[model samples]
Target: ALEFMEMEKEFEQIDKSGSWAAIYQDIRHEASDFPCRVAKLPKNKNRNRYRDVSPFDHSRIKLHQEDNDYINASLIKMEEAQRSYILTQGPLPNTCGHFWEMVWEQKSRGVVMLNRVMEKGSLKCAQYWPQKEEKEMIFEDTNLKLTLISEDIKSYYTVRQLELENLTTQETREILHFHYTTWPDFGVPESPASFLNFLFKVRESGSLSPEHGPVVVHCSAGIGRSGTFCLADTCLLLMDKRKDPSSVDIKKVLLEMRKFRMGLIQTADQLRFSYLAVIEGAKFIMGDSSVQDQWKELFHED
Candidate 1:
């Protein structure tokens, strides 16, 4: 009976019209190749950027002893890598002075650090007040040799007036309409579409530079928005590559990223949903080609 049931299921002709697999396959062929995966940083529980106690702040911030062990483990792994980038969602931590020092030590050992702080107020001012003080303490002790920048949207608007006199400026780049929004709870807001479009534009314009290095994206716990951004970026890269073999392989990239940090995106649900979201994005960009031609070809039915 089980065998008969299995046979029946096989012949059931499951409705895949709304299926993610169908969409992925459609986009794959419509674009003429599979989407490449972009590499992402591992998802570490210790790396939650939105927590009351920042991951970088070890002292005042109470951490499970295992968390400390994880940090040390992460540092060891980071030291082995060629480059490292740090993205912080909110205010910096004061107790993280030693953490910053560790980061600098890793950098001195040939790790490149790209630090981006995305907060509402100036890094110079204590907008988050006590939290700001914690960040300042870390900043004061930092080696300050690497690239440091505040990607606050307000600052971008006033970039002409904004200058970093204290730190040696290496390079400055800009992303438009950048804003911080909360995670999945924020609902499927417009930012994801905007971000997807931005990536597509970037790929189309041929302006994506590897020299800019791997983007370090962080928001609070580096889960929701951050994960979404990474996933979208990976999908866009995949779509771009489908157009050409020389394009970046985003899946391979993500696989490698998982090695450094566990659960980079952390949740299978998020991953599955991201696949669907990209499908919607593909339809948005490519139109009904799936129904028009590609689908027919795959089905071999006129």
Candidate 2:
């Protein structure tokens, strides 16, 4: 509790000084030592969405069923918080099959997509899931079929339940798709409260627990917004589990998470927003019942 107050003061000082750029650069510099050689191989080169954004070889998830065991995805395991997230890029047209394959083999129960299929003038992500007109889509390469069972759309986000079936094994499973449509690339959400509300909604489902596979999180390149979401969620969880919420250092946690994947959080604004969100999240974790209502009001305004 004392530590939380101290960190709160630190956040204020940092905000007052506007030193988020220096802090973010420090993290980027320190996090640059890791090697992602596998993502550079000729066979796997085209699988990447961005040439520079590659998953570290050590923590990259390997596909078992595919002939080539490569995907631009990383398994980020925060052991202390007991959280695991499969962080990857938005699927390309060619890598769509591999995307579902990773989800199936990993046994993940939920997918958190932070971007939309189209952004501005360009295509950010492939139309990977079924639309209203087409209730089902099939991936011939992996023999996987996805049927959209239900969809609940809100102003800024959408919740979808998809039925994933393996044609070979004739086995099917349901996957929750949480699509936050409003978050822009290289930008934070409109407010920390709204982001936390979405985070809490995902949390209430219990898909983030250790029992299920890691919840897959992605933006266009799977680092900027994706990283911010994972970091905030993990820190809030750790704060809840810790008797001293102040002991959870936000930058330290980001560095640890960066070890699993390069460039988790993109801009300084994103890093600062993460701190704000985590601090706000801590208030709720510490038994502030009004936090939920306050967040709901923020969304109600939308």
Candidate 3:
């Protein structure tokens, strides 16, 4: 395993040298040529909150008969790592009902949200989950109901155990909703150590395992922070496989994932953050144990 200091310096050199932006451009350019089947579909485009972002038809999730046969979401598959995830936009006011329906149909085990409901006094996402203290949030359209059964708030993340029930079927399933509440405004985690701790929390719950359905992950646009989360996780999973830790190429894996969904990694900063997290996470996974324990403070408050 490489020394943490050496890895830090190496990543910092590549991070600030304008190289990150170049890789992002490569991803965007390559993704542009990738066929976006539903981009122009009337019902599909209407369901999209942002006109610029749409799911490719080959991988887009389709709903039966309620409305548009499409949702602004992509089913991302990491074959080598044996993992799958749904990358989607934060639910819009009009599309919240459809959002839950997708979850039920897909049987997603968890929803990893990377943005707050309101950021800088503007709405980044809607209140899509349920609440605990009475007045359970109900979706009148889908015969779906979600109730927050338990919530554990951490310094940088909140893990909620939600009960999702299909009213017509009278069957219920427990869903884990992990919200990475600190980002875009508060700032990236101090190190990949903190982020990895959070990542492992989700992994340990078996939601990320292949035995369960793909986890649903989203941010404001499903491209920026959401991409970062999936990229870092995939990179680490690749490392966990039968290869040397350093052999994992962050850019290459990100590019591969971009094939599944356009704009998989958001900005230069988020890209840099991905590299940092991967390098630091590799250190933790390969040999160094201290990186796993030194993550105490996360936000300005902590």
- If scored against the real structure, what TM-score would every candidate get? 0.42, 0.94, 0.90
- lDDT agreement of model 1 with the native: 0.34
Candidates ranked by lDDT:
2, 3, 1
Considering every candidate listed, which one attains the maximal TM-score? Answer: 2
After best superposition, candidate 3 residue 289: deviation in angstroms? Answer: 5.0
Candidate with best lDDT: 2
| Tens digit of per-residue lDDT, candidate 3, span 129-183 | 8766465777897778888889999877899998888898999999999988777
Cα lDDT, all candidates = 0.34, 0.87, 0.79
Taking all chains together, the TM-score of candidate 3 against the true structure is: 0.90
1 or 2: which has the higher TM-score? 2
Count clashing residue pairs in model 1: 18
lDDT of 2: 0.87
Give the C-alpha miss distance for residue 299 in model 3, angstroms.
10
Go through the candidates in order and give the clash count of each. Answer: 18, 0, 0
lDDT of 1 by residue, 236-299 (tens): 4456445442233333444444443333443434444454445545555555544335433432
